[PDB]
Design a protein around this ligand. Structure first.
Ligand code: ADN
Ligand code: ADN
Ligand code: K
Ligand code: K
Ligand code: MG
Ligand code: MG
Lengths: 380, 380
């Protein structure tokens, strides 16, 4: 009755995550000046280059050079020896207004409450009672391993670390009436960029003693756990020099690590009218409210939209058999307690607030008591 | 016992799909000259611009200007009146060699059979007996609606159509012992770019009579079906001018439309050593072989890898209760019949053949009898 499940995460300096953080830094900069900014900012990163591409309509005056470079500085790429330097990289901007055809169809002359969806699409929310934060253990551990690397890099415990890292965690689970119970960690992978001077054995020892053992509860680790630590043997070249980055290429790292489902939309760089983000946040909020409310132990929520239409086209609830109530009953409860119009979500989840850069690494869910992580008390 | 499920698809000229097709055109061009080319080609599209970014190590001599422009020509963007023209757009190239640190860790001096994975990561395969091609009806219909638009555009039946389109299909399903049974189409969305001269009513009538009714079996369509046709009211600006495109931003459109699961990796622009693609193809192949072999009606397969390691780190089978055999038994059958090392997958699925551009629109699965769509006869 046991099975394996694997999730991955990446660090703040993984080239794809760099792009997500910059895109949300641009979004936050606009919202600080114009809460109703329309933002669709894609970022591309390669050796020596940050490119901004997309559509922004805003009353703000934003210094893109400063915003991008400050974001890269925060990540830690501040010297050519590290492969990338905020002081001297190229920043290119290819930003235009929102298409007037889109503007007239989505929000122009529409009361905020009844604004249309900024696009069609589908979105999922997921929650599982296997952790206090209602997230799969596989991805929670994966995120925390990268966070520990960043912590030990910035505090100088491991000065040889560089910002680009990847982790992967395989957990053995037990089935429990549709719910899942973690038993043990089966395999951990860690690859992290490092300086030229540190040897492989020193790095592998540190990754086991100072990162994994400092992160993963001992009850999940045993003599049989498999460790793949710096399995490439050498990872000096990294960041954008090692691998092109793009916004929206870590959407499973951003959400549930393969558990639940995904509708395909990226989060970073998008204002609240773009339901790919806001509706995914709302769907998480619904799912966690159902689990924390004791109606189920594990649940998947789908919603979908049409461009220009405020009300969702479909809503679906899948509880994996972990509720006494039928899925139909849960759907009725959701409809009585939630209003998933984008012009209502924005108020409930405070999505004009410039807090988006905080979401763009280590997952959008399970952390920091964002509004979508604070369950709603359900009436039924 | 009924529920809704929604999937979307996009056309060949959706800016994200444009990028996928160009990336695979570049991949195919290299493989035509060098079957062992190492390719990691990202594409970015915005008004007037195609940018290539990434890492290629190859003995080929490729004319990127010709390959990109020929791909855009094939899609149909051949005049400024359409928003984009292969003859006069900018093509920028930021391509470098594969990182030597990656090269030494993955494939250098390693027998082809025992080559390491080109990265860590997780991948899923999925199959469902609800259609002959073992795909969810929602996404099959969504793809076919875009294909019909492209057919009627290219054959001149609807000369006002332009290449950029999106569709979305909501199906009502019935539960059947873990399997799913389509009952009816609940909602269809179609948005497609059009010329300035055609009126909204003419377009909406054509989309219902010449596209939907020509694609969707009448048994699924009834008086209650909801149609959202050109719901924005105007879609003249489109393609990259309307919305920035990036490679790997339609990964759910590329796979199962929200059904099953996804590990996060993009397909287009990647050679066989990059398991994000090859292992996803192999996982589809496993899943379809199990369903077509009569061992289950609906199944999800996970695999995962570590960079530099040939053998998978984990394999998992989820059959939704649609088999008499346990999931453990199915896993044993998979292990006896499949070898999921990347240096074996390449031989079984012929992944050095330059056929990748054919996969980059209308989904990678359920079509064209690619090698991963031809089930393996299982011994057990
Ligand atoms: N030499 C290497 N060893 C391990 N991981 C690497 C190496 N070079 C790059 N990576 C990571 O793998 C990703 C994909 O190549 C990169 O973005 C980086 O995070
Ligand atoms: N005016 C419009 N109406 C409907 N869909 C549109 C419009 N403009 C662009 N789109 C589609 O929506 C996507 C996201 O904006 C675009 O890439 C395009 O496919
Ligand atoms: K890449
Ligand atoms: K976009
Ligand atoms: Mg990537
Ligand atoms: Mg997109």
């Amino acid at each position: 009755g046991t099975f394996l499940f694997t999730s991955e995460s990446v660090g703040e300096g993984h080239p794809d995550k760099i792009c997500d953080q910059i895109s949300d830094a641009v979004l936050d900069a606009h919202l600080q000046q114009d809460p109703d900014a329309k933002v669709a900012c894609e970022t591309v990163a390669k050796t020596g280059m940050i490119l901004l591409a997309g559509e922004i309509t805003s009353r703000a005056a934003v210094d893109y050079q400063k915003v991008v470079r400050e974001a890269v500085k925060h990540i830690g790429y501040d010297d050519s020896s590290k492969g990338f330097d905020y002081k001297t990289c190229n920043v290119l901007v290819a930003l235009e207004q929102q298409s007037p055809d889109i503007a007239q169809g989505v929000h122009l002359d529409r009361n905020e409450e009844d604004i249309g969806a900024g696009d069609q699409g589908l979105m999922f929310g997921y929650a599982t009672d296997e952790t206090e934060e209602c997230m799969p253990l596989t991805i929670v551990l994966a995120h925390k391993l990268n966070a520990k690397l960043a912590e030990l890099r910035r505090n100088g415990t491991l000065p040889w670390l560089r910002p680009d890292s990847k982790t992967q965690v395989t957990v053995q689970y037990m089935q429990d009436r549709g719910a899942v119970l973690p038993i043990r960690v089966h395999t951990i992978v860690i690859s992290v960029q490092h300086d030229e001077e540190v040897c492989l054995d020193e790095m592998r020892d540190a990754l086991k003693e100072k990162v994994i053992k400092a992160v993963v509860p001992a009850k999940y680790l045993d003599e049989d756990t498999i460790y793949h630590l710096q399995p490439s043997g050498r990872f000096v070249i990294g960041g954008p020099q090692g691998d092109a980055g793009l916004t929206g290429r870590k959407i499973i790292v951003d959400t549930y690590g393969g558990w639940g489902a995904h509708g395909g939309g990226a989060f970073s760089g998008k204002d609240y009218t773009l339901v790919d983000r806001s509706a995914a946040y709302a769907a998480r909020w619904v799912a966690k409210s159902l689990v924390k409310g004791g109606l189920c132990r594990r649940v998947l929520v789908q919603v979908s939209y049409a461009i220009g239409v405020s009300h969702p086209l479909s809503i679906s609830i899948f509880h994996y058999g972990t509720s006494q109530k039928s899925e139909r009953e849960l759907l009725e409860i959701v409809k009585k307690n939630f209003d998933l119009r984008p012009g209502v979500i924005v108020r409930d989840l405070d999505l004009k607030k410039p807090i988006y850069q905080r979401t763009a690494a280590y997952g959008h869910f399970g952390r920091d008591s964002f509004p979508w992580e604070v369950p709603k008390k359900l009436k039924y």
